[PDB]
Amino acid sequence: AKSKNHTAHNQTRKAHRNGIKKPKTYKYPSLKGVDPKFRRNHKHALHGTAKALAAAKK
Amino acid sequence: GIDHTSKQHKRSGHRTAPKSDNVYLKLLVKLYTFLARRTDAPFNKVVLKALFLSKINRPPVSVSRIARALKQEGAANKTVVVVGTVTDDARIFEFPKTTVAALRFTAGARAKIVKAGGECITLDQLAVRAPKGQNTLILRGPRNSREAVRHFGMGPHKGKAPRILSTGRKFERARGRRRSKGFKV
Amino acid sequence: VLKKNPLKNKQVLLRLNPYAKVFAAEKLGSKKAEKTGTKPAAVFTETLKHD
Amino acid sequence: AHFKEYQVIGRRLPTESVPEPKLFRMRIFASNEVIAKSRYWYFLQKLHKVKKASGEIVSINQINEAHPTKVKNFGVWVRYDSRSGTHNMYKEIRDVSRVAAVETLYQDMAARHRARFRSIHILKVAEIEKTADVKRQYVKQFLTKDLKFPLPHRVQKSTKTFSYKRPSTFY
Amino acid sequence: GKSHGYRSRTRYMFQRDFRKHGAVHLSTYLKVYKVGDIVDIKANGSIQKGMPHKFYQGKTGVVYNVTKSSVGVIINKMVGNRYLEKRLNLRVEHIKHSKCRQEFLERVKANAAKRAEAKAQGVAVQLKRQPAQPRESRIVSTEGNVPQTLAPVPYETFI
Amino acid sequence: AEQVAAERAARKAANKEKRAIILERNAAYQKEYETAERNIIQAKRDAKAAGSYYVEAQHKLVFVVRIKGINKIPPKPRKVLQLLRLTRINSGTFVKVTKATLELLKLIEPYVAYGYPSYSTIRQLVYKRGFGKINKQRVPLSDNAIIEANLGKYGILSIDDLIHEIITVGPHFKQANNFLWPFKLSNPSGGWGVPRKFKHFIQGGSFGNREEFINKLVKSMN
RNA sequence: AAUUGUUGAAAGGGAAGGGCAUUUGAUCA
RNA sequence: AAUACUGCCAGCUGGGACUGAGGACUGCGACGUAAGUCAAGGAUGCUGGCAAUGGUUAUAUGCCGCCCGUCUUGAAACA
RNA sequence: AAUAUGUAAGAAGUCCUUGUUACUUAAUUGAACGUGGACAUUUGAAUGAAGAGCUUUUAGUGGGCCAUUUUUGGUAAGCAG
RNA sequence: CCCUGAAAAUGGAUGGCGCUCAAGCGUGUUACCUAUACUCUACCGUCAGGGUUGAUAUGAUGCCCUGACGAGUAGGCAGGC
């Protein structure tokens, strides 16, 4: 009793019933996979500029 | 026939009129519907829409949260509006004088406001004093802080609170959570 | 309550277009053009019948 | 349909490299201006490297017969694609106008060689001004002097589905 | 059985061009890559380290990470009924700059220059591009360009 | 409470002023139309007389009607039809001629018939089956007040102004066309004139570009 | 109710039964 | 000059069929110098006949109409 | 080649000045994040959009077939793929 | 175009009757008939956009205005006997 193995029919219609959605983008992207040294120095620089801004403008 | 580009006879997906059978709530809903229909202030429409929210969509607002909101610049002389229930927080010690309008008030929160020097009014009184919502500030509680939303969206490499009954050792801490017994999540 | 068709109801046509009265009065729908006469060039005349 | 002669003059799109492109004119028998332009473009992109997107029509006009009330003999050279191959023919028609002559030729070819309008290509239409170069007997037989031929077995048309008298086909 | 590997059916894809084998020209290593730059991906057969997959050949992506000799590219891959982001680290060799972005910066600079110059007087800046509008009216003169009559040629049996 | 007469008189005065402006603008538009038509005719005449040929500018506006049902349609042409607002059979829209629009029409040519419209048929269409889109509703246009209210920001305040914007493509042609609901026409009164609609116009059918011949079909269907 | 006998009414050229509209017969506000 | 063909008329008019929804006024227009009128955000006036029309059922006529439920890509099947 | 296919066609942008870093550079030399300041008609190609985005739950489904075109096995098949 | 090639078993199929300057064959032009298709109108239901506590007067889940749509197995939801 053989049976049909594989077919791509109606798959495109099934995927298009719920429209294919582009990923939601944000102003600040994820910081994973980035160079650890760059991330550490970015953290230090961010702390420094936050402190400078707090000291300057209150 | 029409090659429809969207679903036919589809509902708006929003809740019109409360699902509850509270007579006082329906009366308040009618009053705010009249306001939002015969006025131009978006505050009335926002309050009317929030009045239809469910229990899970209407989390309680604490007196500490009210004080934190009023601590903002220029918010000291404003009327707090909570569409729901206002609870009492024992972790705070100094409550400034204010005017909070909400549907239901916890006895402890009401006592705290009365002792501080404020008053507890209802939505009808708030509407009477400010028909257009002048000098008001709407407060909403944390909706994603419920314990039932942590389990939502569970999947591998997500860490989304697997649905369990008991907690401790040998309860979903075996293979599938450690690298020593195969794979980690 | 009901849509009345222009070009068949004169009242609705006049309401839509106030210029309709002037158009009808001046009979602008049948206007005689200037009686100018030009002769095609011999080149075009020969190209028309050139087989 | 009722074929009409349209002469179309076209040219390639002007370019800075070659200003004032050459103008090509062709006469086509077509039902309307759209068909005439389509046939003009199709014939142009068979002898010249041109296309509709890389060209334009500067003029299109309708040619009327100079003497449509005079009976003429027309010789038409045609090339057509049959069920097996392409063949060239020369047919002689007798008509008062070129459009009528080519319509008769189209009906003749579609009825006798099963060639459709997509198959018959009009190579050339000319008028034989001397009644001595005709080489077709079916045309020559109608140029004889003192031509009198009767119409035997005349068939009449009746407006009623029943007739009370036996019809006669005299004439 | 069946074979679906990391380099399956790339015989004509991961292959150097004709008369272009050997080492790589010393220009790719001198290109500066920064975060946010849009680059294209084209695998090179000489270098087999950091080679991209078959799907990511010819795709265009933004740069999100800079390493010693590599950059990270974010590529939107269509799986099922959604687009998923893929952060893949590739060597400098199998990556080239995209000229569409450069044309965009050039258009932006011209856009700002025109916005300054035209608005110095304030008349019809028309900073937006337009498609190919239909051609306007024109007059052709048959001075030395008399139209030549053309007729279909008879069928020929040339061999 | 006797000020009703005062507001009535003020409303009448404002309406009369508005009607005066409408009449002046309509007269100007009619004069421009006559001048343009006569200018084209005489330009053709001088070009013919001076041993030359007058190449008319390509038409900048077309009318496209759908002659095919909503069944057995490939997905890309179906999407193009939806983007062109042709979801019912015997539905027509106006299209400005550009490269993008021409390539769009070249894709759904098998299911539509399009051609260059004339002023008379444009006016007849707008007068008879002219419907606007206000609050996502098909409100019929039986007065210039609605047109002015929904299009006054673009300088269009009357049905004649809308017709002018349709015939002559201008700065606000996109908004003018978007404001108008697609025209739902009926089957032709005198018939399609061909035995098989789904064949090209050169091939003897309604499918394909009809150029100036679209006017007769549009008026028969309207 | 299935089934059966009489009375009263209708139909019946190798089926009956139904729907779209009407004539005729019986009955009905 | 006329005529054939195409396109336009915010040119006129003859004949026939379907429809009468809405229910004191509200608006946009026209005629009328002005009263007032109108084919202008959905039909009224007059007159005639009866106090048969029409509802249910049976037969007849023109057309259409395969046996209910399940399995199946496929049922009415000689499943 | 055609068809099919990715990316860009802007305010999450561009430009001027200069604050931070434990990154880097011979070096205030580059990189990131910034503060202040300038550019709203025509916000940067056309068209469209009973609005778009996001979360929870779950019924049934996991034997298909046929039609145009491309095409495998087979001589062919209302054959299989 | 037609003819020989061209022979299968109950009695039968351009549906048949039948048709011969066809009612057969190719092409060109008009008129004519119709789908639950298209345009308008009347009614029902659904959805969307709104008005209506200035009342004796009640059902603001009530009333009214405008626009669009209405197929369907398994299955889901809602309103009702």
UniProtKB/Swiss-Prot annotation, chain A:
Alphabetic keyword roster: Cytoplasm, Isopeptide bond, Ribonucleoprotein, Ribosomal protein, Ubl conjugation
GO MF entries: structural constituent of ribosome
Basic residues: compositionally biased ranges: 1-25
InterPro entries documented for this protein: Ribosomal_eL29
Domain of life: Eukaryota
UniProt GO cellular component terms: cytoplasm; cytosol; cytosolic large ribosomal subunit
Cross-link (Glycyl lysine isopeptide (Lys-Gly) (interchain with G-Cter in ubiquitin)), chain numbering: K51
Region Disordered: start-end pairs: 1-36
Record GO biological process: cytoplasmic translation
Entry keyword annotation includes Transmembrane helix: no
Subcellular location, record wording: Cytoplasm
Subunit-structure text: Component of the large ribosomal subunit (LSU). Mature yeast ribosomes consist of a small (40S) and a large (60S) subunit. The 40S small subunit contains 1 molecule of ribosomal RNA (18S rRNA) and 33 different proteins (encoded by 57 genes). The large 60S subunit contains 3 rRNA molecules (25S, 5.8S and 5S rRNA) and 46 different proteins (encoded by 81 genes).
More about this protein: Present with 51100 molecules/cell in log phase SD medium.
Family note: Belongs to the eukaryotic ribosomal protein eL29 family.
PANTHER family linked to this entry: 60S RIBOSOMAL PROTEIN L29
Name this polypeptide is given: Large ribosomal subunit protein eL29
Protein's organism: Saccharomyces cerevisiae (strain ATCC 204508 / S288c)
Curated annotation (Swiss-Prot), chain B:
InterPro entries (alphabetical): Ribosomal_eL18, Ribosomal_eL18/eL18-A/B/_CS, Ribosomal_uL15/eL18, Ribosomal_uL15/eL18_sf
Subcellular location: Cytoplasm
Matching Gene3D superfamilies: 3.100.10.10
Modified sites of kind N6,N6,N6-trimethyllysine: K49
PANTHER family named in the record: 60S RIBOSOMAL PROTEIN L18 (PTHR10934), LARGE RIBOSOMAL SUBUNIT PROTEIN EL18 (PTHR10934:SF2)
Further facts: There are 2 genes for eL18 in yeast.
Complex and partners: Component of the large ribosomal subunit (LSU). Mature yeast ribosomes consist of a small (40S) and a large (60S) subunit. The 40S small subunit contains 1 molecule of ribosomal RNA (18S rRNA) and 33 different proteins (encoded by 57 genes). The large 60S subunit contains 3 rRNA molecules (25S, 5.8S and 5S rRNA) and 46 different proteins (encoded by 81 genes). eL18 interacts with NAP1.
Protein name: Large ribosomal subunit protein eL18A
Protein source organism: Saccharomyces cerevisiae (strain ATCC 204508 / S288c) (Baker's yeast)
GN (gene name): RPL18A
UniProtKB/Swiss-Prot annotation, chain E:
Cross-link (Glycyl lysine isopeptide (Lys-Gly) (interchain with G-Cter in ubiquitin)): K31
Biological processes per GO annotation: cytoplasmic translation
A GO term, aspect molecular function: structural constituent of ribosome
Cellular component GO terms, alphabetical: cytosol; cytosolic large ribosomal subunit
Quaternary data: Component of the large ribosomal subunit (LSU). Mature yeast ribosomes consist of a small (40S) and a large (60S) subunit. The 40S small subunit contains 1 molecule of ribosomal RNA (18S rRNA) and 33 different proteins (encoded by 57 genes). The large 60S subunit contains 3 rRNA molecules (25S, 5.8S and 5S rRNA) and 46 different proteins (encoded by 81 genes).
Assigned protein family: Belongs to the eukaryotic ribosomal protein eL21 family.
Name of this protein: Large ribosomal subunit protein eL21A
Organism in which the protein naturally occurs: Saccharomyces cerevisiae (strain ATCC 204508 / S288c)
Curated annotation (Swiss-Prot), chain F:
Other remarks on this protein: Present with 101000 molecules/cell in log phase SD medium. There are 2 genes for uL30 in yeast.
Database matches in SUPFAM superfamilies: Ribosomal protein L30p/L7e
Keywords in alphabetical order: Cytoplasm, Ribonucleoprotein, Ribosomal protein
InterPro entries referenced in this protein's UniProt entry, alphabetically: Ribo_uL30_ferredoxin-like_sf, Ribosomal_uL30, Ribosomal_uL30_CS, Ribosomal_uL30_euk, Ribosomal_uL30_euk_arc, Ribosomal_uL30_ferredoxin-like, Ribosomal_uL30_N_euk
Subunit-structure text: Component of the large ribosomal subunit (LSU). Mature yeast ribosomes consist of a small (40S) and a large (60S) subunit. The 40S small subunit contains 1 molecule of ribosomal RNA (18S rRNA) and 33 different proteins (encoded by 57 genes). The large 60S subunit contains 3 rRNA molecules (25S, 5.8S and 5S rRNA) and 46 different proteins (encoded by 81 genes).
Protein family according to the UniProt entry: Belongs to the universal ribosomal protein uL30 family.
Protein name in UniProt: Large ribosomal subunit protein uL30A
Gene Ontology terms: biological process: cytoplasmic translation; maturation of LSU-rRNA; maturation of LSU-rRNA from tricistronic rRNA transcript (SSU-rRNA, 5.8S rRNA, LSU-rRNA); ribosomal large subunit biogenesis
UniProt entry tagged with the keyword Cytoplasm: yes
Classification via Gene3D superfamilies: Ribosomal protein L30, ferredoxin-like fold domain
Pfam families linked: Ribosomal_L30 (PF00327), Ribosomal_L30_N (PF08079)
Source domain of life: Eukaryota
Organism of derivation: Saccharomyces cerevisiae (strain ATCC 204508 / S288c)
GO cellular component: cytoplasm; cytosol; cytosolic large ribosomal subunit
Example GO molecular function: structural constituent of ribosome
